[PDB]
From a paper:
[name] [[name], also known as [name] (RHA) or [name] ([name]); EC 3.6.4.13] is a [name]-box RNA helicase which exhibits unwinding activity for both DNA and RNA substrates. [name] is a large, multidomain protein whose RecA domains (RecA1 and RecA2), which are required for helicase activity, are bounded by multiple auxiliary domains; these include two RNA-binding domains (dsRBD1 and dsRBD2) and a minimal transactivation domain (MTAD) N-terminal to the helicase core, and a helicase-associated domain (HA2), an oligonucleotide/oligosaccharide-binding fold (OB) and an RGG box C-terminal to the RecA domains. [name] has been implicated in several biological processes, including regulation of transcription, translation, replication, RNA splicing and processing, and DNA repair. All structures were solved in the presence of the nucleotide reaction product ADP.
Broad crystallization screening with human [name] alone and in the presence of nucleotide analogues (ADP, ATPγS and ADP–AlF4) using multiple commercially available crystallization screens did not produce protein crystals that could be optimized. As the structure of human [name] was of the greatest interest, seeds prepared from crystals of the species ortho­logues were utilized for crystallization efforts with the human protein. Using streak-seeding techniques, diffraction-quality crystals of human [name] were identified in the presence of ADP and Mg2+ in similar precipitant conditions as dog [name] and a 2.62 Å resolution structure of human [name] was determined. Despite similarities in precipitant and the use of either dog or cat [name] crystals to promote crystal growth, human [name] crystallized in space group C2221 with two molecules in the asymmetric unit. The second molecule in the human structure superimposes with a symmetry mate of cat [name] and similar packing interactions between human and cat [name] crystals were also observed in the extended space. Hence, [name] represents an inactive state of the enzyme. The inactive conformation of [name] lacks an open, continuous channel through which RNA could bind.
Numbering used by the authors: 272 to 314, 320 to 588, 605 to 741, 747 to 1152
Write the structure that this text describes.
């Protein structure tokens, strides 16, 4: 049944007036109501784009390739290549013979499997434009190959002619490796090695230097070209990271027009024929060391040996071999294959210690969520205390201090257990690993108009098995049944086949590489047609691309921003409404976890409070940033005490803050005036129109995530399906479900598809805000308005038509703004009134809502 909307008469007239002034019309109600009318309305030429190549040039002595600028005012300013080379060599020779701690480290370096192949690798790279380096995870490709290359130029008095850029799929990899390589050279990051991820960098010195970076960073720098680089090392190509795949397309055209460049493709033990053929049948340098066999097991076995009994495609736990016992069979059938059996892992750990062979256990799990769950299951049991066990988590989102703990040795008599994601599959190798427990799962992000746990591939299961066979004969415990193993895919589908292409689409256009479809048709494995059509559709709707699929001034800005394009447009809209800072903060916050420390899953009494009365996880977040920033004014310890008092993750806040500042930077440079991006005090209780607008702009950004509240935790999603409010939400009630929301309409940040469907990052919006920014299709029969063919509003046909008219006027202003962003200082009066009407519609009062008194 429809939702009643109580507009005031004065508001009803105001809408009608501004529409009249904007020179728009109210489409009349339909003569026959059974045939409704579309209130949502629509509304250039430039050039055409042919095939182009990204330019290349080798290292120059008067050029810093990492800052992309000249060296005029330095101590190596007008120096000659030879002095630079000779100085850097003598520096190093000296360091080598004096530093006895460094010598020891270099001795460790020289035992790694890859050391053997040093000469073979350097010669190959010397000869051929492209080389593939192939070998097992742990031989030392990532850490050593870039050093081999650098040191080769240094020792041979060519140090000035060597700048190596190394790409990595993941942020934590570019940083960790940069720090590890720096340490192996007795340095801090910032000398010979550096890193550059989104929102964080420690640039290395301009000469004889290695930069580790994520592909996105490298891509976003490429519109200048690949300036002053001699080697491009594309690492971990076998992960089929979509941006790596894309970059490989760019680099193929590069090597073809500039054969003096050196590309180095580095890969785990897979069939690299794909990549070989792609790069003109390039050499393949094989690398290996000693492997020991690993006795692998499956969900059957695990139950057979532990004598486990659980608590009271098709399901593959119902299928078991005859050679297994009756209880094993009956026990395995009790387990649900959508979960990972945490009790069985505990049992397997106990089986391990009865083998009496010391060594670490490596446990593969999908996501932090399960690593935390498994952590608490264990620690809340005497046996797994500090005395017997050291249980360390491993994933992207933990302090780098605790990353390095996984490599540290442990007091003897203590089993080290690493609870890890797939980072520890091929990216990093943990030492003294004899045992592996494998969930056989993956946390991929399938979005089709959103995360999800799926089955890993045979290849994944094979490479997880191999982690336990680098020190002695190992064991691997797969938690999937044997019947499930057979129905597994041989390979994970590459991200290129199942990821949105909007960001790649803009990149192609920013770099003037040609048509989106034409370019992506040259990929080693081109993406599906529909994904290309979706990407093109989505960027035309945003006005990122024009009708000819050419890049607009809006699209250009969205391409320069390291954020999802929709959020990029939301940020420009914020600039227009002079709430830029708040929106940049919301945007920045999307790229990091929640700042809140959720010990218990249910949300605490202090965190709730930051919500105020806005029923908004987003407002909560803005409110902590304001309080954290105030608490910051008393220095480090005040910040520290504020954070662990209020139960917050201080690093998250600093990362988000620094992200924001850079997002603002790119806006400033794009022409937007400083005044629209100042920080603005606000309250989360009283009337605040700035925050009202921020909610409206939030509703635009997170669309199409919209939902309707039934009762308790139950909600409805955009296609009529139902789902739950996530426990982490401020809007989530206790075991007693009394919430009494002044509106049932929320927008949200994430769909978490576990066993159930959960909505995360929920923010209450008014029916008016829904109509304005959080809907596309609006249909009126005169009385009832139908929103995105599932939500039904009983509202004035005239009002709906006007709000829908505003939406379109706003979009139109965005276009004009992005041609000359500075004009927001001096908008014409009608546009000013149009902004003010949006300001007015954003108020809770505008929909007859009052937040200040308890409902
Ligand atoms: N931060 C680190 N701490 C300890 N050992 C490390 C670290 N980084 C790399 N190693 C060691 O280096 C070796 C693997 O080097 P790496 O270049 O990562 O191999 P791959 O060829 O798999 O890329 C292993 O012995 C691993 O434990
Ligand atoms: Mg590696």
């Amino acid at each position: 049944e429809p939702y009643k909307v109580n507009l005031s008469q004065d508001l009803e007239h105001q809408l009608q007036n501004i529409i009249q002034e904007l020179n728009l019309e109210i489409l009349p109600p339909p003569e026959d109501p059974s045939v409704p009318v579309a209130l949502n309305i629509g509304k250039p030429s430039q050039r055409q784009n042919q095939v182009g190549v990204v330019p290349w040039s080798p290292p120059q002595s008067n050029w810093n390739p990492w800052t992309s600028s000249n060296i005029d005012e330095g101590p190596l300013a007008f120096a000659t290549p030879e002095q630079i080379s000779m100085d850097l060599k003598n520096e190093l020779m000296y360091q080598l013979e004096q530093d006895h701690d460094l010598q020891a480290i270099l001795q460790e370096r020289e035992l790694l499997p890859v050391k053997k192949f040093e000469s073979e690798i350097l010669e190959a790279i010397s000869q051929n434009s492209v080389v593939i380096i192939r070998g097992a995870t742990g031989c030392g490709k990532t850490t050593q190959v870039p050093q081999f290359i650098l040191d080769d130029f240094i020792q041979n008095d060519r140090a000035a002619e060597c700048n190596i850029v190394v790409t990595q799929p993941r942020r934590i990899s570019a940083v960790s490796v940069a720090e590890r390589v720096a340490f192996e050279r007795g340095e801090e990051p910032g000398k010979s090695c550096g890193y550059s991820v989104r929102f964080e960098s420690i640039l290395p010195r301009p000469h004889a230097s290695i930069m580790f970076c994520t592909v996105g960073v490298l891509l976003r720098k490429l519109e200048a070209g690949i300036r002053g680089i001699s080697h491009v090392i594309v690492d971990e190509i076998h992960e089929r990271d979509i941006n790596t795949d894309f970059l490989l397309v760019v680099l193929r055209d590069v090597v073809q027009a500039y054969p003096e460049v050196r590309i180095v493709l580095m890969s785990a033990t897979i069939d690299t024929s794909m990549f070989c053929e792609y790069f003109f049948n390039c050499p393949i340098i094989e690398v290996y060391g000693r492997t020991y066999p690993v006795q692998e097991y499956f969900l059957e076995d695990c139950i057979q040996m532990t004598h486990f009994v659980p608590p009271p495609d098709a399901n593959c736990n119902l299928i078991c071999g005859d050679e297994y016992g009756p209880e094993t069979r009956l026990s395995m059938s009790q387990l649900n294959e959508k979960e990972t059996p945490f009790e069985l892992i505990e049992a397997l750990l106990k089986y391990i210690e009865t083998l009496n062979v010391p060594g670490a256990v490596l446990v593969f799990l999908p996501g932090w969520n399960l690593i935390y769950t498994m952590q608490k299951h264990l620690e809340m049991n005497p046996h797994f205390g500090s005395h017997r066990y050291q249980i360390l988590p491993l994933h992207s989102q933990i302090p780098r201090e605790e990353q390095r703990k996984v490599f540290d040795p442990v007091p003897v008599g203590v089993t080290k257990v690493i609870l890890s994601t797939n980072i520890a599959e091929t990216s990093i190798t943990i030492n003294d690993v004899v045992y592996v427990i494998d969930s056989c799962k993956q946390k991929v992000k399938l979005f089709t108009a959103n995360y999800a746990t799926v089955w890993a591939s045979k290849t994944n299961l094979e490479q997880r098995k191999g982690r336990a066979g680098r020190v002695r004969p190992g064991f691997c415990f797969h938690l999937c049944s044997r019947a499930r193993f057979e129905r597994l895919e041989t390979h994970m589908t590459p991200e290129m086949f199942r990821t949105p292409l909007h960001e790649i689409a803009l990149s192609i256009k920013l770099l003037r590489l040609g048509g989106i479809g034409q370019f992506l048709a040259k990929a080693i494995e081109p993406p599906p047609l529909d994904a290309v059509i979706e990407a093109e559709h989505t960027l035309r709707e945003l006005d990122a691309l024009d009708a000819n699929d050419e890049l607009t001034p809006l699209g250009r800005i969205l391409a320069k921003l390291p954020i999802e394009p929709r959020f990029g447009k939301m940020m420009i809209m914020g600039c227009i409404f002079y709430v830029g800072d708040a929106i940049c903060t919301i945007a920045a916050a999307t790229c990091f976890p929640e700042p809140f420390i959720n010990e218990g899953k249910r949300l605490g009494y202090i965190h709730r409070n930051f919500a105020g009365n806005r029923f908004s996880d987003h407002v909560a977040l803005l409110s902590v940033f304001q309080a954290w920033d105030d608490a910051r004014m008393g220095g480090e310890e005040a910040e520290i005490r504020f954070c662990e008092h209020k139960r917050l993750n201080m690093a998250t806040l600093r990362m988000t803050w620094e992200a924001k500042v850079q997002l603002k930077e790119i806006l400033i440079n794009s022409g937007f005036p400083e005044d629209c991006l100042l920080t603005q005090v606000f309250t989360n209780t009283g009337p605040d129109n700035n925050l009202d607008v921020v909610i409206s702009l939030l509703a635009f950004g997170v669309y199409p995530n919209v939902c309707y509240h039934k009762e308790k935790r139950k909600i409805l999603t955009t296609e009529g399906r139902n789902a739950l409010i996530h426990k982490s939400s401020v809007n989530c009630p206790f075991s007693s479900q009394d919430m009494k929301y002044p509106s049932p309409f929320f927008v949200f940040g994430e769909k978490i598809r576990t066993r159930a469907i959960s909505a995360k990052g929920m923010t209450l919006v008014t029916p008016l805000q829904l109509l304005l920014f959080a809907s596309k299709k609006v249909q009126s029969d005169g009385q009832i308005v139908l929103v995105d063919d599932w939500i039904k509003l009983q509202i004035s046909h005239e009002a709906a038509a006007c709000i829908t008219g505003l939406r379109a006027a706003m979009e139109a202003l965005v276009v004009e703004v992005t041609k000359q962003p500075a004009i927001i200082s001096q908008l014409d009066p009608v546009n000013e009134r149009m902004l003010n009407m949006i300001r007015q519609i954003s108020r809770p009062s505008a929909a007859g809502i009052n937040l200040m008194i308890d409902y």
